[PDB]
């Protein structure tokens, strides 16, 4: 009947045709890159296949770690990036992925000597570039509408293009590196951000006179004071001369040069940080490999309590995804899938890449999954948050969501939107009426409206959670909790000598003790990937 | 009974009377230029003809290529102009384009070399002079706590065309440029604008009006130099390079023009793309009646249209375009998107002048809670009709029954019934009641699929036309030979710059 | 049946599970650290365990001392840190702190010269830079809210290069003997006032920062070697970026609290390290109010930035640190707006730093930075809040407040009577329906009275009502055998006489009988 409604769970047959589940779902393979994000039982889960990317919608101390991180990094048989915050899903997973999965584990810290370095310079072709070094520049540079005058953005944009111009022109050409030995110049083999940086005060080079270093104003040594016969600007290919002349007209000139260079300074300023500065110095992994090699990447960082990290983690992120944008029909070796657990979403401020990139993203198998608190965090001002329009492209692209129940008033507004989503369906009303003397009685049965679930009742769902799939009807479901179920202790168990010691494999651990007894085993760095690995750059 | 409500789906009858089908529907001609907007079956199409407008309301990932883009694309007979965003569309569709029905296909890529060009000083009748040059300069410098100066970098860019008109389309200036002292071109671009005879009396006047070069030469030069700053860009500098296709024909020859464009990953694009739009509305506002060589329909499937930002040129031509058989389908992600302040939308009052201007809307549904307050209105919009609820009663003793019939109010659809409709959607025609039918998915019907299979070998050996392709193994089959591209137009006569 | 609702009170057995209560509540041990927020009864309570936070949306004068402070600073036996602006809790329960749980009392008013003091440079070791780019940062508060952040926080580089020359000269005997020969005088131990002024450079004649490094005042340098020069190399790079006078004019802007002379002496020494906050058995009460006077407000901001960050260690990286620490944060937002629990409120629980947050309503958290937390910072303190306690108040304007609250109560299915008679014969017929009815309605929360609502996040509504301390043997017991005056007229065990025991009680408050040692605490005099 649905004189009332048709709101109904969604059916075991389309879940399977959905890939959600199998005919015999306690004992599937996961031979399609699935990701779970629910179970009906120990060990029968519901797992997302395909390419489309997931959402959770949890509160805080909801249970998004030990219900949807921990299980897939535990689980998941592809390559995971997974963004770690507080350090603990890798100290937790890393033995994991690398005993079970033979993946190797690349740790990103960039406030920390001990982490594997990202050089954005390490993916442009010296000897295609203008492209990449504008993308660079748009990512170093932003665009914004706040500014009342965008002018000194622009021109310390197109002097950071004419940087690298020069540097490609001096260091990557014939005539240049002739003339770099000529003129005894210090310039790396391959540069860094710190370095055009330091190319705002000019080119180092040895005075031929004094034997000693100094540095020469970009003015003055390309057709300026050092420069009056212009053979130096003779150096660079006719394209950066002409940008070079460009500039000087409408930028670097007048009262504003002086002020086109400090923008360009403290867009830099950043790599002053001897930690950010180290953690840049080079490149341990090709990030083009992200879907040919077996690997797992932890990305340590918390840009609140770092303002500085903020725009490392966008050239990260932004080098880290337009890298893999190669569809696999077209590069055949790039066959893995990439799961970005974006664990604490909100954590990353204003990062420009995911709202640029999540809606071609799929089909190149850089899958994400955006872990939040709220709506409202996503929807906040662009230091914290995304933008109203930020955040609904975000959401947009989001094709199952996650809804975990929590009881408190602050979410009100929210369960009751989900309990309208939900719709409702027709149920039976029984009424009585009774012969007070007799007593005799009649009963009627009428038809009435319900809610699928009220506003209450989502909130007090505990730990089941509702799925919305934008192609399903509503699915509820049990957490994936890992530490209920042998299907995840066992493989934690296997790796750790501690928790052999004391549990049992297949049978579920002994609930009083195994949270207890699995963090002092991560304490000792039984669960925790290879630290030795991880290279322990100095202050240079 | 109508107590609760009158709420009902159009009738057949009614939808052949509006022409969205014919009596015998799987064998109509499709003489019309209809537009395909639904499917009652394979082969059994509801498609829009007339001039009217369509709307698609379509949630990301909910089907409109596979429903919409591509079933026309590969049977809409007229003239196409697509927005391809991803550079897919024209890459499945090319080949049939010009196979098919004949037509020579155009595509414009500002990011990249290989492209064709547009140059709207092509457009202009160097010999109502200098009314395309204010025309051009109001692109140029949009309109908008910094008053002024904007203004007066409009009237440089205005006497700057008006300088480098006098110094080509004079007896005069032909041998003071032969002075050998500049190198203008032959025609102008906007670069070559950017980098530099009453009526040129005038004009030095105007070099020294407002004095807005004394002592406030800089201010000026800097507005200036950022409103010209797209065309330091090499690729955008080769995409105004020259101009290829003259949008003044396009209602007369038989062509399909691709635009490779993303301004939210590059906001550079967005006045090209303004400039591009501009030049190709306007450039036929003439009846065919007056021109009765203009009789070619030109269908504009603006896919991604919320993606182009704020195209003002749209909200002032949405409302005239029509009898000029410039003919648009909007596919926006939803509504909120499209009212949104200038930056990213066109406000709330020039939105909702677009979509008045709409009289065919469809409607996707999806299950996802961000879309419920759209669904949620729309089933509002359905209206209800009136139904029987039946109640029983039994005496506990005896066992008689007792049964009661009584009239309550029903959705026509609910929202949730709407976000699960799954491969089904609903039209709203003005002039019609609700219609419920299923996408025109391209994919799964063989009235697309042999057009896809004939111009392509591999397909060709792979499954026989007339019959539904194994749906196991067609799109990958369909994306292996894309790869090859046996599916797009031929990409030799795209012309590639420096 | 729930066709019209399923809302239901939280069975015993959940709150059993939850900890909340034992399968014998009126002897419950106790022994879980936990918090009051509730009884069911004389003697039987609702106590949170675990780590989680709480909250308490009291409005005013509902009753947050009686109801939920004093209880809890009877019973509590952990360390407690409270927020006494009235002075009344800690003047009530400083007897009953001392001489039940043997835990020393540290009182920090600020604006009495009888107070315990606070250094923030107490917490440095003589990871040097590391902890001095902190402590700048928490003095120069870093806000995006100004047309250039480059205005100000080279002072902070500035504090940094005078705290190392400090480390070069004062705790080096090379620097001493330097010091020795020129007669610079400085307290072996430095403090904020003097961190403010070593912006008028040395300082018998007070001479100025440039003069006395390669100026006038010193040109043969023997002054810039002595000193470790990294610091002159960290000041060459800020010397080249009217300006240097901004600079030192934002450097003793920020300084100026401590040119009064109470702030003076409350930040003079540091009698309780902070690192100790959870090994020692300790109760520390803040007596202070930032919304009479502001310039209060960074000075509290310091103290608890530097309470919480030190106390950020895990007890399993160091089990030295064992005790818990309940953060009794009354009048909450009396506070102002101090950036640290907003910023580290998210990872507090796992470090045994318990606070219960006390509002009146919602919407004032939410208040400008001025008065409240920003709407922001308000979402962030709300969203680390596991059990919220709703008192109730028949006062139109909390009206919306338990209107939604309501609703998060929900409905459920009550049988509805309905009565028919025929007039001649007189035989009547009754039936029976099912109808919707809100768990509680507005207007009954509003006229709760002395009951409150309890929402934890993972469990049902629970209503109770309040743990009242006045009302029970539970503490008045406790609150007698500390009192001489109050032990002659009540006996213990029995409940006491209502009409006669609060006056009573404030009677021995004003003679002292109840309150903390206070001969124990430091007087001060002027600087």
Redesign the interface.
């Known amino acids: 009947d649905d004189?009332f409604?048709?709101?109904s769970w969604e059916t075991e047959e389309k879940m399977i045709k959905a890939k959600l589940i199998t005919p015999n779902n306690k004992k599937r393979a996961f031979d399609k890159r699935e990701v779970i994000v629910g179970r009906r039982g120990l060990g029968d889960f519901i797992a997302y296949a395909g390419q489309?990317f997931i959402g959770l919608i949890a509160?805080?101390?909801?249970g998004k770690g030990v219900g949807f991180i921990m299980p897939n990094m535990i689980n998941y048989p592809q390559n995971i990036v997974v963004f770690d915050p507080?350090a603990d899903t890798m100290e937790t997973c890393g033995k994991i992925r690398e005993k079970r999965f033979n993946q190797k584990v690349f740790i990103y810290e960039p406030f920390s000597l001990k982490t594997h370095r990202f050089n954005p310079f390490a993916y442009v072709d010296f000897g295609d570039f203008?492209?990449q070094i504008?993308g660079l520049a748009?990512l170093v540079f932003p665009?914004r509408?706040n500014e009342?005058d965008?002018?000194f953005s622009?021109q310390a944009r197109?002097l950071f293009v004419i940087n690298c111009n020069i540097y490609r022109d001096l260091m990557w050409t014939k005539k240049g590196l002739e003339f770099v030995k000529r003129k005894k110049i210090i310039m790396p083999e391959t540069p860094t951000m710190f370095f055009i940086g330091s190319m705002a005060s000019g080119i180092n080079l040895i005075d031929e006179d004094t034997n000693m270093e100094k540095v020469v104003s970009l003015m003055e040594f390309f057709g300026g004071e050092e420069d009056k016969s212009g053979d130096n600007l003779r150096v660079l290919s006719p394209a950066t001369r002409n940008?070079w002349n460009?500039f000087k007209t409408?930028?670097g000139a007048?009262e504003?040069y002086s002020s086109v260079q400090g923008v360009y300074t403290?867009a830099f300023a950043p790599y002053n940080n001897a930690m950010i500065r180290n953690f840049t110095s080079a490149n341990d992994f090709d990030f083009r490999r992200l879907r040919i090699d077996e690997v797992s990447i932890g990305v340590i960082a918390n840009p609140?309590?770092s303002?500085i990290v903020g725009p490392i983690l966008e050239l990260f992120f932004n080098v880290m995804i337009y890298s893999n944008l190669i569809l696999p029909?077209?590069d055949p070796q790039c066959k893995r899938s990439c799961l970005m657990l974006m664990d604490e979403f909100t954590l990353c401020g204003y990062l420009e890449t995911f709202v640029?990139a999540v809606?071609?993203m799929a089909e190149y198998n850089m899958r994400p999954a955006f872990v939040f608190?709220?709506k409202?965090?996503l929807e906040?001002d662009p230091?914290?948050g995304y933008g109203r329009?930020g955040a609904?492209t975000i959401?947009?692209?989001?094709?199952l969501?996650m809804?975990y129940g929590?009881?408190?008033?602050?979410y009100?507004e929210h369960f009751?939107?989900?309990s309208?989503?939900?719709?409702?369906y027709t149920?039976q009303?029984?009424?009585?009426?009774?012969?007070?003397?007799t007593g005799?009685?009649?009963?009627?049965?009428?038809?009435?409206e319900?809610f699928l679930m009220?506003?209450?009742?989502l909130?007090?769902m505990?730990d089941e959670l509702i799925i919305?799939?934008?192609?399903?009807?509503?699915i509820k479901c049990h957490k994936a909790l890992y530490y209920d179920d042998p299907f995840f202790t066992d493989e934690l168990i296997k790796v750790s000598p501690s928790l052999s010691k004391k549990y049992k494999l297949g049978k579920v651990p002994n609930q009083a003790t195994f949270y207890d007894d699995l963090?002092?085993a991560k304490?000792r760095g039984e669960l925790s990937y290879d630290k030795s690995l991880v290279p322990v750059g100095s202050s240079e």
């Open positions: 004189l409604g048709s709101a489309a509160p805080t101390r909801s507080k203008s492209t504008f748009k665009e509408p009342k965008p002018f622009n197109n940008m460009s409408m930028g007048r504003t403290s609140k309590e303002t029909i077209h640029k809606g071609i608190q709220s409202a965090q906040n230091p914290l329009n609904k959401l947009d692209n989001l094709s969501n809804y929590i009881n408190n008033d602050n009100y009751e939107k989900l309208k989503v939900l719709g409702k149920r009303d029984v009424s009585r009426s009774i012969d007070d003397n005799k009685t009649n009963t009627s049965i009428s038809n009435k319900r009220t506003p209450d009742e909130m007090t505990g919305l799939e934008n192609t399903l009807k509503p963090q002092a304490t």
